């Protein structure tokens, strides 16, 4: 019972602590990077079509 309560307290402390914002910061970086790469590719295609 003591080990279970200690584990529950550790889980609650981890949930309350602001330290989970790692994925929601790492993944959007590469997501918007790929988005900007696609935008640059579309801009190059538009410039080629205009030429």
């Amino acid at each position: 019972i003591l080990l279970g309560y200690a584990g529950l307290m550790l889980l609650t402390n981890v949930l309350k602590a602001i330290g989970i914002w790692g994925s929601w910061v790492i993944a959007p970086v590469k997501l918007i990077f790929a988005i900007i790469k696609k935008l640059m590719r579309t801009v190059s295609c538009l410039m080629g079509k205009l030429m």
Binding site: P28, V29, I32, I35
Partner: peptide, 9 residues
């Protein structure tokens, strides 16, 4: 990396 993220987001 921080500057790239600031430019991207």
């Amino acid at each position: 990396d921080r500057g790239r993220q600031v430019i991207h987001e």
